[PDB]
Design a protein around this nucleic acid. Structure first.
Lengths: 116, 204, 154, 222
RNA sequence: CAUGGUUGUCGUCAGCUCGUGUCGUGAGAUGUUGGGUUAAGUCCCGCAACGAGCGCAACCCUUAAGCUUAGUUGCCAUCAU
RNA sequence: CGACUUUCUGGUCUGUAACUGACGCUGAUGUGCGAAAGCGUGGGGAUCAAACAGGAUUAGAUACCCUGGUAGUCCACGCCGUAAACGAUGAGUGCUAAGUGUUAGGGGGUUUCCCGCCCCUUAGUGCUGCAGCUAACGCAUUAAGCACUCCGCCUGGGGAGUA
């Protein structure tokens, strides 16, 4: 379900997507300095964007409720930028690997505690 | 199979059995004797188109009731032919019989009657389509909650086995409070065999 | 309610295959009323009956002058143009297939006609029906304006 | 007939869009809300009154439709008082005239209400009544035009043509007269007798229906 | 691979259709789409498109609590044996 | 045609309207302007980058990807005169329902005051929609509707934009 081509599309879509989201999405009052990572199906019709936000569990929600409105602008500009034929639909999701990986580091304490 | 004759499931719930007698371990003799009368029935079938017979076994006597298509000549002018039928049955089954002829329901809305009718109509080189149209027309004229007739085989002097169905109204098969009449018939003129299954749904 | 003459214009088994029969039927009394209908079914007589019933619902009233149209007209329906003009008695209904069918079935005895453009029978019949329905009879034309007959007429 | 004061009781109309072919019938636009001229409204009310009285004199049959909210019960009471049938719910295509196999629907409700009289509840198991009663109430609700008509519309009454475009279209196709409440943005061309009244004026709607019922009553009494 | 009749498999998959108004010149559409909701085309809302049928379920049987009739060859509250 | 300032200069719109009094519309031939690329003489050259060099990828990759990079991209004067140069809708004029934004004005009303608002109007620029038109998609007072004037162009596909 993945090919090298999908990987290149993901990388070059990540580079442009980070640029647009932080340099052209003015109107949403909740702008956020975000990091991103994007994956797509083999047919480039579906794309998943994974990102991180700074704030509480009401500020991530405000930023999401702002990204939901801005999706039209993002898709328009992204299609206006890239050579790709069919615009993949875009949905924005938190990169839970950030917190999960952090919890993954947590039990390290337990291994070091019992052996000390 | 996918579809099984529904009157097999219907019997024992709302409707009685085709053949009835007292219960004992000597069922083989009773069934092999009843098969002879069932095969003999064809003689009256070929002229009166009797739908089916319910046979009863008394303490030492046998009671039957045929559903003839018309009672006038099965009963005879004044009983000119019932006695010889009784005598022939007595000779064949090695036991006497008590024939009680009852005319089938006045309307030709039953299943086996119309099944044999359309079978003979096909064998007489008549368009099965037009025969089916007439059959369903008179079926809905007579008044029936649901009626369908299927046909199968090489219709119209062809070499391809095709099937057709022409139904009308609400016809609940998976439902059990249906009180239906499944039938079957076989017909041909020069080409194989052409089976027809007529279904009648009269009341719930 | 009374006797009407019917005739088929086109029977076609047309596919989408659930290909069945569609019927073009004109229905007219040959005494000043005509109409057309279309019907689709699985058997031809049922399609004919449906087309006849549809036609009977929408009946034109063609104005009559001695078995010919009061004046020249040109029906049009989506590239379906047909031009018909009146003619002297004994001329005969000069017209094409669908046009002749509807004209005779409307009671027209003798006219001069010619279709222009599309020859598709459904459009041709709708064109002829439109042309027939937008005819103007002299008596009501006189009544429609303030004038009366016997001062200006055909 | 009609009282000028009752015309003055009626006021205003909704202002979101308007048919510009009605634009001559506005008396004076003010407060951002279009209002109607009551002077010709009274004349039209009187002519509709006498027309319906004449129609009911010879046995005319007129339907009453109640698809819109806030007026359904008014129309139902009007229909029962006038001696005519009702449309207590959505108007379906050909819901009144028994051409669109709604005669089957009314026959079905009749048989399922007669078999219960002959015995259907607690004589046959619950396993059938649980669906039969559900279907019966389903057809009661969906068949809002549950009627005793003989597939004979003759004439009709429409409360709001915007919601009853189907009813007015079928009436025009059947060439039967249309008369009823017509608001500030309904087509008067498709309706033979137009009564320029409002829709939000519920008491005016009730008064108007009572007036048409009195017309039908005078027709039927003599 | 002339067939009837009978039987497997997808598969208890959740679908398959038709009348009728009446949209479209027409092929066609529609109903059967959309929203909530169910394992299910199951229910409701809206829907000039509507209405209806086969199918699902229910209907059948067993069983899971109990009441009535009936206790023999079976059972033993109270009994003797 | 988008940094700012100055100089020179063309067009358009609104209101008044005393002024000339039809001086108007269209427009073959003709003469000019005309994106980008390209050519000639020079100048300049930061980024970018046909060609070209290398690497990567691939069954093969001359291409897509990467590393560089010449002409060119820029300026002055000439030439070239083409585009999916498109609203795929020639110009001019008049008539034919509405609703709602938006740019530049004008007028009236209310409010003490418009910085508000409402109403009316002219000229652009959008969206939705009647009648009407279209084969449909659709257009619909910025018509593809109803009319008149003038010009340009078309008559099956290929051969062929060829000889």
């Amino acid at each position: 379900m993945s090919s090298m081509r999908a990987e290149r599309v993901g990388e070059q879509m990540k580079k442009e997507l980070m640029d647009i989201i932080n340099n052209k999405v003015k109107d949403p009052r909740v702008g956020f300095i975000t990091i991103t990572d994007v994956v797509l199906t083999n047919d480039l019709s579906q794309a998943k964007v994974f990102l991180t936000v700074l704030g509480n569990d009401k500020e991530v929600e405000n930023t999401f409720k702002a990204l939901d409105k801005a999706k039209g602008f993002i898709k328009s500009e992204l299609g206006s930028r890239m050579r790709l034929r069919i615009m993949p639909e875009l949905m924005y999701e938190y990169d839970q690997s950030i917190e999960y990986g952090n919890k993954i580091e947590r039990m390290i304490q337990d291994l070091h505690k019992q052996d000390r | 199979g996918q579809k099984i004759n529904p009157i097999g499931l219907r019997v024992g719930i709302i409707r009685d059995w085709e053949a009835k007698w007292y219960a004992e371990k000597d069922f083989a003799s009773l069934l092999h004797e009843d098969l002879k009368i069932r095969k003999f029935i064809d003689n009256e079938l070929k002229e009166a188109s009797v739908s089916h017979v319910e046979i009863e076994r008394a303490a030492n006597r046998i009671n039957i009731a045929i559903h003839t298509g018309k009672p006038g000549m099965v009963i005879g002018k004044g009983g000119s032919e019932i006695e010889k039928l009784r005598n022939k049955l007595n000779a064949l089954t090695d036991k006497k019989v008590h024939i009680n002829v009852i005319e089938i329901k006045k309307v030709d809305l039953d299943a086996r009657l119309v099944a044999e009718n359309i079978a003979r109509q096909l064998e007489n080189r008549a368009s099965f389509r037009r025969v089916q149209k007439q059959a369903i027309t008179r079926a809905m004229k007579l008044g029936a909650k649901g009626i369908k007739t299927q046909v199968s085989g090489r219709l119209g002097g062809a070499d391809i086995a095709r099937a057709e169905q022409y139904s009308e109204g609400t016809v609940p098969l998976h439902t059990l409070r249906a009180d239906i009449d499944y039938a079957h018939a076989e017909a041909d003129t020069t080409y194989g065999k052409l089976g027809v299954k007529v279904w009648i749904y009269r009341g719930e | 309610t009374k006797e009407f003459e019917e005739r088929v214009v086109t029977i076609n088994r047309v596919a989408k295959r659930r290909f069945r029969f569609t019927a073009l039927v004109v229905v007219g009394d040959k005494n000043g009323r005509v109409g057309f209908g279309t019907g689709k079914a699985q058997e031809v007589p049922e399609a004919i009956k449906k087309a006849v019933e549809a036609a009977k619902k929408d009946l034109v009233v063609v104005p009559r002058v001695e078995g010919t149209t009061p004046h020249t007209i040109t029906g049009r329906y989506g590239s379906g143009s047909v031009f018909m003009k009146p003619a002297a008695p004994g001329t005969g209904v000069i017209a094409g297939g669908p046009v002749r069918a509807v004209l005779e079935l409307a009671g027209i005895t003798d006219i001069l006609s010619k279709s222009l453009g599309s020859n598709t029978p459904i459009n041709m019949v709708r064109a002829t029906i439109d042309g027939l329905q937008n005819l103007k009879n002299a008596e009501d034309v006189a009544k429609l304006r303030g004038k009366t007959v016997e001062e200006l007429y055909n | 007939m009609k009282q000028l004061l009752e015309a003055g009781v009626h006021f205003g109309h909704q202002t979101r869009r308007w048919n510009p072919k009605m634009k001559k019938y506005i008396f004076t636009e003010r407060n951002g809300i279009y209002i109607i001229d009551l002077q010709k409204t009274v004349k039209k009310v009187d002519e509709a009154y006498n027309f319906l009285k004449q129609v009911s004199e010879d046995g005319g049959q007129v339907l009453f439709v109640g698809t819109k909210k806030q007026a359904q019960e008014s129309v139902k009471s009007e229909a029962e008082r006038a001696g005519q049938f009702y449309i207590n719910q959505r108007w379906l295509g050909g819901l009144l005239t028994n051409y669109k196999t709604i005669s089957k629907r009314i026959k079905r409700i009749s048989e399922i209400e007669k078999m219960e009289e002959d015995g259907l509840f607690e004589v046959l198991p619950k396993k059938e009544v649980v669906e039969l009663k559900k279907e019966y109430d389903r057809l009661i609700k969906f068949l809002g035009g549950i009627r005793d008509m003989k597939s004979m519309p003759q004439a009709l009454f429409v409360v709001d043509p915007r919601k009853e475009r189907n009813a007015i279209a079928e009436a025009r196709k059947l060439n039967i007269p249309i008369v009823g409440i017509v608001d500030t943005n309904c087509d008067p061309d498709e309706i033979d007798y137009v009564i320029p009244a409002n829709d939000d004026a519920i008491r005016a709607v009730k008064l108007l229906t009572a007036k048409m019922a009195d017309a039908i009553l005078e027709g039927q009494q003599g």
